[PDB]
Amino acid sequence: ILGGREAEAHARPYMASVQLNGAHLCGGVLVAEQWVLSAAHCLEDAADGKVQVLLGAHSLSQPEPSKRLYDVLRAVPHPDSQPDTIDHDLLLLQLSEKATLGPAVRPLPWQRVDRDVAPGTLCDVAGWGIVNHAGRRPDSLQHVLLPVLDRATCNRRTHHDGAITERLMCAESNRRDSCKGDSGGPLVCGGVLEGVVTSGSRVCGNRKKPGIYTRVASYAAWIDSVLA
Template identity: 85%
Template sequence: MANLSVHLAALILLGAALCAAQPRGRILGGREATSHQRPYMASVQVNGKHVCGGFLVAEQWVLSAAHCLEDVADGKVHVLLGAHSLSQREPSKRLYDILRAVPHPDSRRDTIDHDLLLLQLSEKAVLGPAVQPLPWQREDRDVAAGTLCDVAGWGVVSHTGRQPDRLQYLTLPVLDRATCNLRRYHDGTVTERMMCAESNRRDSCKGDSGGPLVCGGVAEGVVTSGSRVCGNPKKPGIYTRVASYAAWIDGVMAGAEAA
């Protein structure tokens, strides 16, 4: 009986150790997406390496996060569309050069405020079943707390920083701003131009920045590039509200067409 008790105690300790070792910095609770079911998804790449997500908002424009290109310097930026796997050959995949990269003029390195980036492709995207723009919210109002929204990306899936080859996704409930701003969470730093989603072991993470938070088939938010521990229930995910920047988005795209 004593040996059995020791054995059980050892199993319990082993189980606890394994739980503690589970990676926190990943899309926790997520799974591989169905191939090309999110035809708006873009991989923003620097020197051939995925750095951020993004999504097609018009034939020649991808919306992402401003912080994604902060440290690019002389790196070559491309956008990959039509991909499920980043490495495998797929008929729908195509890599586009960037004609213009336009970060929001008020974005800053030391804050996640105004963390938006518009990328103008060198040519209009070739649309098809695997490549389509995503409608984005223009009505400037908050999404109701508890609303289930979809987030996807090729962000890291382990605490060692390993990134998946295939697109991952998860569904997250929206958290109301007042709760998100409580001292035990983000302590008043979430502005009216941001929204939150719960992060209890289910979260977006590094490499997912710039991707869309999709609610009811419409992009409501963009994953910010803020530094935090992914999957920490005390640090809900923060997303830039797209509708709050509708005039800027429309203005940049219209200005490029007029030029």
Template identity: 65%
Template structure:
């Protein structure tokens, strides 16, 4: 994949082509407000000053998110807000960065949930410190044991009435085994080896949380992808894109674009 020499704000729509099964892409329901700047790696992907999706800082100049977030933009451009707890209040370490390149995984697309990852190269390296930090990625391609309690955070809807928070929310969810998640009662065989599930019994990620990290034992294991039309539906566990299988692609893109 060649990304060198692309103009500022170039969008590489590899396979972004209508939505899979009618599901809302990305979907924190019945969670709680995070401590201020407790998660300094969190990013808000914004268009015209409005939050669209989540993401997280993985290197000083790179944010990882979900490719389907591009479907929610009008003109395919983002700015990235870092160092924020509140989206609206003045905060001394909050800063909005322009984006040099948006690079979706070439296998991603509107009509399926495969390869749902997006890399954003900031126009300049983020100023790291107490309020802005990177989050380590899982580098061992292994399954997270079922029942492991993992955390997901974001500024997405906090209820099915589309209430959106101003301050960062989080929820802790147990991982569901792929075998169980693929049962007919749940996702009926749709969950590939590059995906993972977390239970959604009333607590769930919700619309606007897409692209945020699923963090297990301090490591980013997955990226919020999709789930039920109604957040918190126990029959449709949240689906997350596993990160470890994509490390080669992530490293290649970040290396090529330097």
């Protein structure tokens, strides 16, 4: 996250770190007792390595009582996703057992009503992604509050030039922004999961190039089918 602040520890008990060989790779969101939602392309370069999900964390490195690193039984990228597109950019990870729940580990309710938010709606995005142009990596979870940017503006030739389908949404990116390593993490509005940070490399913090997030409501049937 560019331009953000250190999150209150454990105040987002849904927040997950998706890891490859014990290193943070992507954000994710606990959406059911045994399932974490993330971004499709998070595991693009993984097959030779161990995929795990860290729940209950604030610091990536320090011991905390609620921190637990779960193994993954199965990874389910969206079957329509393709490398080098932004569409269908969702991933479901089934943990090796149900997560132990408590004040610091809890699933987030997620949006099933497929309608847009009001422009300007203030949403929260959190992550352990880079925090500056030099690529500095935070030990602890960061966050930013971002207004939603209307799709028409987001689609103009100067911005994302027609690439924002009805299945995607945008948030402003003026200095405050998601960036590398925040892929897969949650965009939360009104205490409900609305979006998932996209995987595609994209420039960070340029107001002219808004953040892109996959709308979870647009994929409710897929999520339900996999979860079941």
